[PDB]
Structure formats: C-alpha cells, structure tokens
Amino acid sequence: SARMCGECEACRRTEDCGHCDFCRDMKKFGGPNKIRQKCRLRQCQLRARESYK
DNA sequence: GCCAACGATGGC
DNA sequence: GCCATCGTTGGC
Ligand SMILES: [Zn+2]
Ligand SMILES: [Zn+2]
C-alpha cells in the first residue's frame, strides 16, 4: 500500500489496541465512527501520515 | 499547515 | 451492501 510498508511492527500487528483515540472512535469499541483511521499502534512507522502515529 | 470530520471505494 | 481505512476538505 501507499501507507503500508508491510514490514514494520505496526504493519504486522493484527489486534487493535482498543484504547487510543482512533480505536475509541470505532463502531466495534462503541464509538461514533466520525474519525475513521486505523489504530495508532497499527499506523505504519515508515509510511503513515506523521500525525497518525 | 493542521486536523476533525467526512466522501470514497477496493475488497469482501 | 458493508467495512476498513484511505485521501480530501473547510474551518481555524
Ligand atoms: Zn488503538
Ligand atoms: Zn510498516
């Protein structure tokens, strides 16, 4: 992907942390789905927008 | 330039 | 049709 190196810790992570702002936004964590980004811990360390990590 | 919010769509 | 999560935008 443009935003995934597929090779760092973040990219290999399969489990949302459930605790960050992005996770708390998610439907599966009871959130309003207004932000719509991946878990902070799954934000590619190389390729993600710097503000997402 | 940032970012909260949202439109878009590939993949299922 | 839905979902995950991307790129875009308007307001600051
Ligand atoms: Zn998280
Ligand atoms: Zn990565």
In one word, what is the shape? globular
Largest sheet: none
Question: Which compounds are bound in this model?
Answer: zinc ion
Query: Helical region count?
Result: 2
Helix content: 10-25%
- What proportion strand? under 5%
The N- and C-terminal alpha carbons lie at a distance of 17 Å
Radius of gyration equals 11 Å
Secondary-structure element series:
HH
Structural class: mainly alpha
In total, how many domains does the architecture comprise? Answer: 1
| Strand segment count | 0
PDB class: dna binding protein/dna
Keywords: CXXC-type Zn finger, DNA BINDING PROTEIN-DNA complex
Assembly: trimeric
Entry title: Structural Basis of Selective Binding of Nonmethylated CpG Islands by the CXXC Domain of CFP1
What's the quick description here?
The chain is mostly helical. It has helices at 9-12, 21-25. Transcriptional activator that exhibits a unique DNA binding specificity for CpG unmethylated motifs with a preference for CpGG.
Quickly list its features.
53 residues; mainly alpha; 2 helices; 17% helix; globular; binds zinc ion; DNA-binding
Description:
With 53 residues, this protein is an all-alpha fold. The protein has one domain (1-53). The longest helix has 5 residues, at 21-25. Helix content is 17%, strand content 0%. The structure holds zinc ion (2 copies). Residues 4-5, 7-8, 10-11, 44-46 line the site of one zinc ion. The structure holds a DNA duplex (12 and 12 nucleotides). Zn(2+) 1 binds at residues 5, 8, 11, 44. A zinc finger (CXXC-type) spans 1-45.
